[PDB]
JSON list of C-alpha atoms in Angstrom, two decimals:
[
{"chain": "A", "resi": 3731, "resn": "UNK", "atom": "CA", "xyz": [-11.66, 0.63, 19.77]},
{"chain": "A", "resi": 3732, "resn": "UNK", "atom": "CA", "xyz": [-11.88, -0.45, 23.41]},
{"chain": "A", "resi": 3733, "resn": "UNK", "atom": "CA", "xyz": [-8.30, 0.59, 24.13]},
{"chain": "A", "resi": 3734, "resn": "UNK", "atom": "CA", "xyz": [-8.79, 3.89, 22.28]},
{"chain": "A", "resi": 3735, "resn": "UNK", "atom": "CA", "xyz": [-11.97, 4.60, 24.26]},
{"chain": "A", "resi": 3736, "resn": "UNK", "atom": "CA", "xyz": [-10.02, 3.84, 27.45]},
{"chain": "A", "resi": 3737, "resn": "UNK", "atom": "CA", "xyz": [-7.55, 6.66, 26.73]},
{"chain": "A", "resi": 3738, "resn": "UNK", "atom": "CA", "xyz": [-9.13, 9.99, 27.66]},
{"chain": "A", "resi": 3739, "resn": "UNK", "atom": "CA", "xyz": [-12.87, 9.42, 27.62]},
{"chain": "A", "resi": 3740, "resn": "UNK", "atom": "CA", "xyz": [-13.09, 8.55, 31.32]},
{"chain": "A", "resi": 3749, "resn": "UNK", "atom": "CA", "xyz": [-8.76, 21.76, 31.37]},
{"chain": "A", "resi": 3750, "resn": "UNK", "atom": "CA", "xyz": [-7.01, 20.91, 34.65]},
{"chain": "A", "resi": 3751, "resn": "UNK", "atom": "CA", "xyz": [-3.79, 19.00, 33.79]},
{"chain": "A", "resi": 3752, "resn": "UNK", "atom": "CA", "xyz": [-2.81, 17.85, 37.28]},
{"chain": "A", "resi": 3753, "resn": "UNK", "atom": "CA", "xyz": [-0.97, 14.92, 38.85]},
{"chain": "A", "resi": 3754, "resn": "UNK", "atom": "CA", "xyz": [-4.32, 13.55, 40.04]},
{"chain": "A", "resi": 3755, "resn": "UNK", "atom": "CA", "xyz": [-5.25, 12.99, 36.37]},
{"chain": "A", "resi": 3756, "resn": "UNK", "atom": "CA", "xyz": [-1.91, 12.55, 34.59]},
{"chain": "A", "resi": 3757, "resn": "UNK", "atom": "CA", "xyz": [-1.14, 9.48, 36.73]},
{"chain": "A", "resi": 3758, "resn": "UNK", "atom": "CA", "xyz": [-4.57, 7.90, 37.23]},
{"chain": "A", "resi": 3759, "resn": "UNK", "atom": "CA", "xyz": [-5.07, 7.90, 33.45]},
{"chain": "A", "resi": 3760, "resn": "UNK", "atom": "CA", "xyz": [-1.61, 6.41, 32.87]},
{"chain": "A", "resi": 3761, "resn": "UNK", "atom": "CA", "xyz": [-2.19, 3.64, 35.43]},
{"chain": "A", "resi": 3762, "resn": "UNK", "atom": "CA", "xyz": [-5.63, 2.91, 33.97]},
{"chain": "A", "resi": 3763, "resn": "UNK", "atom": "CA", "xyz": [-4.20, 2.68, 30.44]},
{"chain": "A", "resi": 3764, "resn": "UNK", "atom": "CA", "xyz": [-1.39, 0.40, 31.65]},
{"chain": "A", "resi": 3765, "resn": "UNK", "atom": "CA", "xyz": [-3.90, -1.87, 33.39]},
{"chain": "A", "resi": 3766, "resn": "UNK", "atom": "CA", "xyz": [-6.06, -1.92, 30.25]},
{"chain": "A", "resi": 3767, "resn": "UNK", "atom": "CA", "xyz": [-3.03, -2.92, 28.17]},
{"chain": "A", "resi": 3768, "resn": "UNK", "atom": "CA", "xyz": [-1.96, -5.61, 30.65]},
{"chain": "A", "resi": 3769, "resn": "UNK", "atom": "CA", "xyz": [-5.50, -7.03, 30.79]},
{"chain": "A", "resi": 3770, "resn": "UNK", "atom": "CA", "xyz": [-5.28, -7.49, 27.01]},
{"chain": "A", "resi": 3771, "resn": "UNK", "atom": "CA", "xyz": [-2.53, -10.11, 27.62]},
{"chain": "A", "resi": 3772, "resn": "UNK", "atom": "CA", "xyz": [0.44, -8.24, 26.15]},
{"chain": "A", "resi": 3773, "resn": "UNK", "atom": "CA", "xyz": [2.30, -11.54, 26.42]},
{"chain": "A", "resi": 3774, "resn": "UNK", "atom": "CA", "xyz": [1.12, -13.92, 23.72]},
{"chain": "A", "resi": 3775, "resn": "UNK", "atom": "CA", "xyz": [-0.82, -11.34, 21.73]},
{"chain": "A", "resi": 3776, "resn": "UNK", "atom": "CA", "xyz": [2.28, -9.50, 20.47]},
{"chain": "A", "resi": 3777, "resn": "UNK", "atom": "CA", "xyz": [3.56, -12.65, 18.76]},
{"chain": "A", "resi": 3778, "resn": "UNK", "atom": "CA", "xyz": [0.11, -13.05, 17.20]}
]
């Protein structure tokens, strides 16, 4: 639920939004410890 909420909840369709959102989602995924958790 946290990762889903951190998808589009925080029209224009510009590079100022299509890249900030992608970087934020990547940071959210990395903060979840992709290493270790995938094997779990």
